[PDB]
Design a protein around this ligand. Structure first.
Ligand SMILES: Nc1nc2ccc(F)cc2s1
Length: 167
């Protein structure tokens, strides 16, 4: 048993809810929250901007030190950093950004990072301002992630379309 509440069960391991991931993280304090990161860990907008704002910019300060030491992530890659006030850990995962012309085949590689963690609170990778079709992102998630993933979908309209179209 875990602390996640109000989720619809899609599969053995994937759950979904219409929820702001910031507010969900603040309530649950999960072991792992996933950020929709870019390779520079520049948390300007979308999920990343909202998570970083909720940490009072501490996520960005930590991220800048990480990049100064290690250089940029790979598209499809990830790093584990602090979860600050939101979670124990933040798994920063880089899905491909369609609005930059990145290979959508890298979305499966991105979701494979989730398998290193038994339970995660996450957004749909490459959705929102990353430009991919969220229906596709949910299909790749279900077909790739084997650990227990609690997906927060911010937009109520999109949530209802994801559920009602799910095979
Ligand atoms: N407070 C929140 N802002 C965003 C922005 C984008 C998003 F996909 C999810 C959320 S939750």
């Amino acid at each position: 048993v875990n602390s996640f509440s109000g989720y619809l069960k899609l599969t053995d391991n994937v759950y979904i809810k219409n929820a702001d991931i910031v507010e969900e993280a603040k309530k649950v304090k999960p072991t792992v929250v996933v950020n929709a990161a870019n390779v520079y860990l520049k948390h300007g907008g979308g999920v990343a901007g909202a998570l970083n704002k909720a940490t009072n910019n501490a996520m960005q300060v930590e991220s800048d030190d990480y990049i100064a030491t290690n250089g940029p992530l790979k598209v499809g890659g990830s790093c584990v950093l602090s979860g600050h006030n939101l979670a124990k850990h933040c798994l920063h995962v880089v899905g491909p950004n369609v609005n930059k012309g990145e290979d959508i085949q890298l979305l499966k590689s991105a979701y494979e990072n989730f398998n290193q963690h038994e339970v995660l609170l996450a957004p749909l990778l490459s959705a929102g301002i990353f430009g991919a079709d969220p229906i596709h992102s949910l299909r790749v998630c279900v077909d790739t992630v084997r650990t227990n993933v609690y997906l927060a979908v911010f937009d109520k309209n999109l949530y209802d379309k994801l559920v009602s179209s799910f095979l």
